[PDB]
Amino acid sequence: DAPMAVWLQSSLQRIFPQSPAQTAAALELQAARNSRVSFQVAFRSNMKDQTHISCSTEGAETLHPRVRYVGLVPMPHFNTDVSPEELDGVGYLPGWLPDPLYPVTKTEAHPFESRSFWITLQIPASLSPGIHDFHVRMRWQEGKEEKDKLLHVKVKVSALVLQPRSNFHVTHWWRGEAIALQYETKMFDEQWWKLTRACMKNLIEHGNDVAFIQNFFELRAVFKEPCQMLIVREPSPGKYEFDWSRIKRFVDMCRELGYKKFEWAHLWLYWGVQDAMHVYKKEGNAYKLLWAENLSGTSDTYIHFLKQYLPQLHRFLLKENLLSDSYFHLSDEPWSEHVENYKKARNILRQLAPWMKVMDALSDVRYGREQLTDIPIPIISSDEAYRKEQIPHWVYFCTGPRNKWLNRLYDTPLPKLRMSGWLFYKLKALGFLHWGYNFWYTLDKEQPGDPFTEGAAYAYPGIAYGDPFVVYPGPDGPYDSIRWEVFSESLQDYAILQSAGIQPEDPMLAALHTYEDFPRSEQWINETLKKILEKA
């Protein structure tokens, strides 16, 4: 019955506004050295009158603590095709959903509403192993009396020191046009470049080690201001020249941030493999297409442009030392019938750019086995087939699959999401790709949206709430979300397995059978980490 409740809680449990108060005061955490670890400080006012509340740490200076506030976004409906066993928030949703993380340490406490701060700890490589403790102080007012409570946090620091992940690469298709739309700035202006640096820095600090370049704008939809980072001009009919200066700046920036791998945009448009890319040239204030919207992939015009572009790309790659460090795309998901479309396109590349190896989403194993692509990217629900053929591959996931399958949605429970990197490791994926880092705007339209009130690009239920974006637009760059912090900590768990020498075949991982059939409790994660980290 206390006027104000405050408790500690782990990073794998959502707190909904109408959650009941808990009592805690004490939390123990575990961490490898050179790693990052998270927890929540929850609070619920039992007072008619609103008040202020402040979160702070004491004695945590060596862990460079970071204190943020968990904001809520509206979730209108549960995502479809998800059984209740696989939904988070049963009893609480549809309703307010915790997700964005805001950089404040003081907020207003509202009557009878459970909220939380999110605290991020940096465990340095040099820290002495064993137990390190600190305190969290919560301060508020009851009338004119000042009140406070201390809570006790313990981190049991393993001897294990994490090494950089190897032979596993992660890419997200971040969107320059989303920055242009949500912040209302000219594409490639200097504000655009700050926001882009800030995003790429966010990505690499959350485990994404591949920097996407959209040299060609990716959408079928035609934009007035597309994000085409390659500059193209057409002085006389069918003779093109190319200015690489924007891509060159992006590569400089990403290399300064720590990237070594880069990824290039698609070369044929995703209606099957049947259309050519939309490529624009500047004119007046905005951009205009070089050829017809419906131009075919096998056209004379588009192949005449590839005859000139691909060698220029090769010269750029040489000049900037990017051949061995680039991943290339052709086109996405040809069904069986589309196969010959893509075969023709692939042979065209082999003729014009034999140096270029391709990777693409091919979920049909019978047609990724045929060698259509060079490195296939099945959706996770086709992973098993590729594994029985033992074909090496990347995996991706998007609005689907759902129900029992791994995913990253608003209503995917956090422990399930936290299994991502364990599954990546045990099922021996080469890498993971995802389309929806900051796709903040209206699906397939040059029309900004509102990520703080709309989580499915206005396309629910085909687009699941949570699929388009894991970060939110902040005034100077991205705000993280809970999902993104958990996903990042999951890529870290993949580094824990690797650094500790655990083999995918190890019995402690044997219940991870598919991207569908796998343990998904916070306890399995805690117990398995305790074994690994205390063996050391």
| C-alpha to C-alpha distance for 212 and 261, rounded to whole angstroms | 9
Question: If you write DSSP's letter for every residue of 430-450 in order, what string do you get?
Answer: SEEEES-SB--S-TTSS----
Q: 292-295 contacts: CB < 8 A, separation 24 or more? A: 293/222
Interface with a second copy (CB under 8 A), residue from 112, 258, 288, 444: 112
- For a second copy, the binding residues in 413-442 under the rule CB under 8 A are none
Binding segment for a second copy (CB under 8 A), chosen from 16-24, 321-329, 426-434, 463-471, is 16-24
Q: Which residues pair with 269 in a beta bridge?
A: 275
- Pick between residue 320 and residue 506 the one whose CB is nearest to a second copy: 506
Residue 231, beta-bridge partner list: 243
* Residue with smaller CB distance to a second copy, 50 or 347: 50
d(CA 31, CA 44): 29
Site string for Na ion, 349-368 (x = CB under 5 A): -----------xx-------
Work out how close the CB of 301 gets to a second copy at its nearest, in angstroms, rounded to a whole number: 44
Q: What six digits make up the tokens of 157?
A: 């620091």
Among 20, 164, 284, 475, binds a second copy (CB under 8 A): 20
Task: Work out which of 184, 337, 453, 505 binds a second copy, going by CB under 8 A.
Answer: 453
Find, among 1, 39, 31, the residue nearest to 131 by Cα. Answer: 31
The least CB distance from residue 247 to a second copy, in Å, is 41
Q: Of 72, 70, 142, 132, which Cα lies nearest the Cα of 101?
A: 70
CB neighbourhood size of 317 (10 A): 19
Counting contacts by CB under 8 A, is residue 311 touching a second copy?
Answer: no
Is-contact 444 220, C-beta < 8 A? yes
Q: Which is nearer to a second copy, 159 or 511 (CB)?
A: 511
Q: Work out how close the CB of 359 gets to Na ion at its nearest, in angstroms, rounded to a whole number.
A: 7
Rounded to whole angstroms, the Cα distance separating 520 from 66 reads 28
Sequence-distant (6+) residues with CB within 8 A of 319 are: none
Whole-number minimum distance, CB 440 to a second copy, in Å?
19
User: 91's torsion region: left (phi>0), alpha (psi -120 to 50) or beta?
Assistant: left
Phi, psi (degrees; rounded to nearest 5) at 527? -65, -45
Between 44 and 261, whose beta carbon lies closer to a second copy? 44
For position 77 contacting a second copy by CB under 8 A, the verdict is: yes
360 binds, among Na ion, a second copy, none (CB under 5 to 8 A by kind): Na ion
User: In the stretch 374-413, what mask flags binding to a second copy with x, by CB under 8 A?
Assistant: -----------------------------x----------
Which of the listed partners (Na ion, a second copy, none) does 332 bind, with a CB threshold of 5 to 8 Å by partner kind?
Na ion
CA distances in angstroms from 292 to 223, 232, 244, 276, 385, listed in the order given: 14, 16, 24, 9, 39
- Among Na ion, a second copy, none, partner that 77 touches (CB below 5 to 8 angstroms by kind): a second copy
Q: What is the CA radius of gyration of the chain?
A: 24
Residue 86 in contact with Na ion, rule: CB under 5 A: no
CB of 351 to a second copy, least distance (A): 47
146 is a contact residue toward a second copy (CB under 8 A): no
Closer CB to a second copy, residue 93 or residue 211? 93
Q: Which of residues 32 and 464 has its CB atom nearest to a second copy in the complex? A: 464
Q: What is the DSSP letter of 165?
A: P
Q: Which of 33, 115, 165, 329 binds Na ion (CB under 5 A)?
A: 329
Cβ neighbours, 10 Å, residue 10: 16
Query: Is 479 strand, coil or helix?
Result: strand
If you count them, how many residues does the chain have? 536
CB of 453: closest distance to a second copy in angstroms?
8
Question: Near a second copy by CB under 8 A, which window of 77-85, 167-175, 288-296, 303-311?
Answer: 77-85
Query: Does residue 521 interact with a second copy by CB under 8 A?
Result: yes
Contacting residues for 285 by C-beta, under 8 A, at least 6 apart: none
Count CA atoms closer than 13 A to 475's CA, side-chain side.
2
Task: Select 88 or 209, whichever has its Cβ closest to a second copy.
Answer: 88
Question: Residue 226, by phi and psi: left (phi above 0), alpha (psi -120 to 50) or beta?
Answer: beta
- Work out how close the CB of 45 gets to a second copy at its nearest, in angstroms, rounded to a whole number: 10
Among 3, 103, 111, 258, binds a second copy (CB under 8 A): 111
Question: ∠ at Cα 326 (323, 327), nearest 5°?
Answer: 135
Closer to Na ion by CB, 45 or 341: give it.
341
Q: Which is nearer to a second copy, 84 or 284 (CB)?
A: 84
Q: Is residue 332 a contact point for Na ion (CB under 5 A)?
A: yes
Q: Minimum distance between the CB of residue 441 and a second copy, rounded to whole angstroms?
A: 19
Tell me how far the alpha carbon of residue 269 is from its chain's centroid.
23
Q: How far apart are CA 458 and CA 453, in angstroms?
A: 10
Q: Supply 198's token pair.
A: 């800030």
Site for Na ion, rule CB under 5 A: 329, 332, 360-361
Site for a second copy, rule CB under 8 A: 1, 17-18, 20, 23, 25, 48-50, 72, 74, 76-85, 87, 90-96, 110-113, 133, 152, 403, 453, 461, 507-508, 510-511, 521, 523-524, 527, 530-531
